[model samples]
Target: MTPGEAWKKQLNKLGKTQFEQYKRSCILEVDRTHARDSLENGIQNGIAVSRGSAKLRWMEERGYVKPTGIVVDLGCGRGGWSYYAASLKNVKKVMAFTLGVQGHEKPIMRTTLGWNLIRFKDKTDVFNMEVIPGDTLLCDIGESSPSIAVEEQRTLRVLNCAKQWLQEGNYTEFCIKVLCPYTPLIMEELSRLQLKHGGGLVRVPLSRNSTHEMYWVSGTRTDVVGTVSNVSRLLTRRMLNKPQPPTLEDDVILDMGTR
Candidate 1:
């Protein structure tokens, strides 16, 4: 069956009513109303499942991961990626870690797909968490506008955490999807991590054409410096200083090529 057909089947298995009940169970009582709105949209559009599944498909098509290799779903909101990873053929194991409440509370849903879901309250939990070496890391950090200093610290901490656990070679890849405006920042941070951990980096549009507004930065850990190394540091500072909306020229330029 096609991916769409498969997704339909999966959706059928977990209907709107089931999802609503699941959401109610997982989110805090205070967040139920807000969560309901978000959850309902994802369910209607299949955004919750489709995105992570597409990322996995892209990695597989590019031979980024081995069938027996472990997949780590970092910042696994709603555990959609976790479930999809676990369902992949010959995947040894899938471990999903997230600080998002919708994700943290979805252990039952994760287990149904044979994934090990780990949830934490804060960055400390993420820092102290243990990980198996050589595992592929998948992250969708979402949008954040924390102060530059704070954002930089958190970015370093998270990248360092991934670096410490990810072994060089041995079927490993680090993948992150982020919004268009923050693409430069994410790319810069990943470049910084690559400098220390040694990795090759590449950027790809998250979806075809203008249908989506995100991009993926995926690469393997290596001992070589990235081409964007010099400019990335400067770009990072610029990213922090300028918080303005993207201009038409900026959009056209970014759409022209990849790195």
Candidate 2:
């Protein structure tokens, strides 16, 4: 299969099953108008996911994955993003942190096996996964030991990855697609992990009640003799499966998890 064809196949395998289920679980399915809005939101997310994958591929093609580097996916729901990174053969390792949702915490954890099986269901590929059942808000980058918490080790692994790129360097560019607005608290956390050695940042906050602002944060950090792209993106899209035109509060989004 051609490269694009392979990518399409991967997306279909990913999109048709998981993406559809995730989309259907949004807040807009109740009313037709709400559903339409939800679908549009899904389109943006779908694009973001695909584009994020594209970024991974672009980084790999340009020799971004360092010999001793690792790619970490925060807020990895079902391990999809990490899976995309792993697909980039150059990446030696991909680590993902799995977590529960915002308000559905208790029930989701109690019943959903602590957010396990968020990825492909076949038990075979399960070995490529790890289970860190907690809120990503508190996931620490310092504690992940070499053999234990590999994701945490990525705190410095990316620097090595960037050095490889410089050896074969050309003007490589990065873009973080903005999908929605995020709480300043979250952005602060990301800034710590994503800022490169050099100082530069670009924020394109998504503007819509149905949308949240996302950061396409990019920068370059230099090592002893080289620099690498400090990169990562966050998903702050509004609740997709909530009821539009909230009943008591007309403009508020309503809880529609069960609906």
Off by over 4 Å in 1: 1-50, 64-67, 102-124, 167-171, 176-198, 207-259
Clashes of 2: 16
TM-scores of the candidates are 0.48, 0.28
Error of 2 at 64 (Å): 10
Off by over 4 Å in 2: 1-68, 100-209, 219-259
Q: Please give the CA lDDT of all the candidate structures.
A: 0.43, 0.28
User: How much does candidate 2 score in TM-score?
Assistant: 0.28
Span of ten consecutive residues with least summed lDDT in model 1: 249-258
Candidate 2 lDDT by residue in tens digits, 218-259 = 332323101111111111122223323322211112121110
Among these predictions, the greatest TM-score belongs to: 1
